Amino acid sequence: LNASDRLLEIMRLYQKQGLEMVGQKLDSYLADKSFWAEELQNKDTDFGYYQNKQFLFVANKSKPSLEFYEIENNMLKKINSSKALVGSKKGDKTLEGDLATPIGVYRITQKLERLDQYYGVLAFVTNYPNLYDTLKKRTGHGIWVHGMPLNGDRNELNTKGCIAIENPLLSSYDKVLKGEKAFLITYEDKFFPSTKEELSMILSSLFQWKEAWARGDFERYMRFYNPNFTRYDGMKFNAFKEYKKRVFAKNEKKNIAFSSINVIPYPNSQNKRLFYVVFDQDYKAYQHNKLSYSSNSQKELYIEIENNQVSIIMEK
Amino acid sequence: LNASDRLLEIMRLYQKQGLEMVGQKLDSYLADKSFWAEELQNKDTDFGYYQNKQFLFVANKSKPSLEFYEIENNMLKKINSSKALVGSKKGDKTLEGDLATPIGVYRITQKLERLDQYYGVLAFVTNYPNLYDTLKKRTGHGIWVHGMPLNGDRNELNTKGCIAIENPLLSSYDKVLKGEKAFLITYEDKFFPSTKEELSMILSSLFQWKEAWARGDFERYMRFYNPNFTRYDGMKFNAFKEYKKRVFAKNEKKNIAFSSINVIPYPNSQNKRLFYVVFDQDYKAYQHNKLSYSSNSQKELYIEIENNQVSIIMEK
């Protein structure tokens, strides 16, 4: 019914008004919650939305366990899962030396191999502290996913924060990964999944925010920002709002494109509905029809849904 | 492969590779017979393909009769029909004074309202001789669809070529038209409608021809022209080909777009599979990335399907 009509509309528009208006039409779909609701409806969405192929570790601190997944077309393929050794401290990591495995969403940045035998066949390095941790002034470093001792020793019951699993299993995950980055979701006790409604609200808001930003609609853009907002460099809501008003008043032409978007539910002490959003951004600005600024960057947002409203709490 | 799949593919491509690749994909659909077959499958296609809302008169010289239709979204709504008076001569109109109602596809270009009472309430002026008639060097003029004498006289069984119907019905048609142009399809004895297969072949060919033209593929462009080809200004195939060879050798970049497309079966005395194609064309040419030429024009083609091949027999 509407599939034939939607296609025809695009096809007519392409010939009558050109490819640019086709692009604008497709953008209006990406900004529509009901578009995402339809698009997400038969996807495996519990661990979030993943535009392209991605790999996901999921750690339950309490059990403790480590699961590993392939995600393609937002469909999950569980590779394996085992028991795991974790830090001895419950709740959050906040301080160097505090013995906690952090709770939240992290990134595996690299693989170390020339290690002490304690660490097993390899260590996958997480990015603790992540942006959220950093803006909350939490300290420490060197939280890794690694193996059991090559010594045979199997003395400890608890790590000092790292996550440890059996070495044959670990090497299998490495073989699947093939040097690609992976996400890590670490939670405590119970995991509350991202729903399709939440993802549809976040995704549709993301594209609305982008359109408001690009088109220069100041009041619409600012509405996405939580009054508690912190920018990656420490800037707070009022200074940010002030700076953006000035910038928007220039009315520069801007083309902004997002790609490889991921939206991942962010486990937290208070069970607020927090999400981590990460994507690549191609940003271009113009002055009197000439390119004045261009960048290609990795953007990060932390987003809250509260009282059924989406807001940005942190941005890089 | 269906409309849903095509929409998913377009959006996937836009997200993954951007807008240029989307354009190329849409081009490949427009050039694809099976794409058109899918869009056409549930539409009323016997009197042709019509992108926008149009009005159609259909005249059967033999009966004689006149029908009036509205077409929207390629669905036909019959407004009314009646007997009509027509010219005394059967077959084609080819000469001034030959008393023949022409066979073919015509356009109603204007309404006349200050006429001899013989003509009744109004006359719709047809464009006889049309481009096809003109390039066959047929003569005559002033073929109208008009009413019956206002004094109530009924002293003729035939006109000299005009189509005449009762005044109240004709007024009702004028009220539906509300000043819009209309097409007139006139046939004798039997009407041979355009099939969905024929319209699919013509529409895919039209877009293939356009892209061969725009990209400067001389061989592929030329294959669409019938060896009997005549251009609107009298230029024949050999001079045309020679000229186009030169033009194409320059390798200018061109962007061409077709809109408000109609494809209409063209009744003819030989019962050849002829079609009239009319559309708005946006044409742009560039030299060293600067716009050198632009036009917005009404194009006309007459096309034949013979031996299962589309060919252009005439072009404006």
UniProtKB/TrEMBL annotation, chains A, B:
The modification Cysteine sulfenic acid (-SOH) is found at C162. It holds the Pfam family YkuD. One of its GO terms (biological process) is peptidoglycan biosynthetic process. The keyword Transferase applies. The active site is at H146 (proton donor/acceptor), C162 (nucleophile). GO terms for molecular function: carboxypeptidase activity; endopeptidase activity; transferase activity. It comes from the Bacteria. The keyword Transferase applies. Residues 55-185 form the L,D-TPase catalytic domain. Pathway: Cell wall biogenesis; peptidoglycan biosynthesis. InterPro entries: Cds6_C, Csd6-like_dimerization, LD_TPept_cat_dom, NTF2-like_dom_sf, Transpep_catalytic_dom. Keywords: Cell shape, Cell wall biogenesis/degradation, Peptidoglycan synthesis, Transferase. Belongs to the YkuD family. This is Conserved hypothetical secreted protein. It comes from Helicobacter pylori (strain ATCC 700392 / 26695).
